[PDB]
Amino acid sequence: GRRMNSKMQVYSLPKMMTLHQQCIRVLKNNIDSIFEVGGV
Amino acid sequence: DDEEETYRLWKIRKTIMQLCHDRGYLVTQDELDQTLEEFKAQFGDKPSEGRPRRTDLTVLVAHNDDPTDQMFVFFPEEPKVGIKTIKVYCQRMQEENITRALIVVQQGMTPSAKQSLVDMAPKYILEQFLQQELLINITEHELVPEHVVMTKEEVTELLARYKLRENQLPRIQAGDPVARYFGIKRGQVVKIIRPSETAGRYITYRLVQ
């Protein structure tokens, strides 16, 4: 008796993300989780 | 365009000749299946110049059962038709002692013209017909069944058989398109033959009111 239930925002990450781009975009999705960057 | 009005005039003529053949007037088979190229041969092609002239398109037919009884079919050249031109046609009716006539207007007539046709209808029978109404034969439509104008003897034996008065029949208006097509007045009875899905055939009788 399981109920099927899901939604989808229709449309129309296909992007060559290198090391610095991946690092900055991971930080751009988890900004608030930084305690102390060290010496950056 | 000259070609559009040439096609119009040919179709109007063909419908008029079908109408006259249906009313019982003597119409030869050559004129009944007369085609557009035969209209371009018999008449002109450029009505703006006037090679087919509407006055040249006037039809004279005679009744099958009485060759001294004839019908005119006039085609006025003006869009709106008043007293002057129908009095010209009435003088023509008098001077060639014709009884019935059809006037095929192309836009209409004045109200006083319609009143005047009703006025001399006891003496001379004139019938208004628009060009747009005559651009097809309505009796060939699939909805329109077979209309047959009954002779007064047939009406007499009809009301004798069914023991009916005239007012106990179904009615049809005098301004009905098929009643106008067959040119029938009050007191005439139309036999209407139509196919039936339960009986096969059914004959209704309709008095012209």
Binding site: - | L158, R161, P195, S196, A199, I203
Partner: protein, 97 residues
Amino acid sequence: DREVLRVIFPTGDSKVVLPCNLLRMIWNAQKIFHINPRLPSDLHPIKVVEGVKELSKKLVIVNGDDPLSRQAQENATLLFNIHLRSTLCSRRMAEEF
């Protein structure tokens, strides 16, 4: 009759609504009289023809002998007489029924 039918029904719909169910009546006659369908029958085709003619005279809707009455009676039972002739054929009553 077939030309009349094709005039009446230009769409080719053979379904009509008619009083007597002739096919079921024929099946009733087969079951009542124990008709063996694999034997020769003692029914002369002229009996079929004349019986259908007399029956069609006997099914009167419009009464009288006036030609107006005759035409109305012919029109009132046109489909049923067509269907009765198409069903009680001498051919169909011999090889089919």
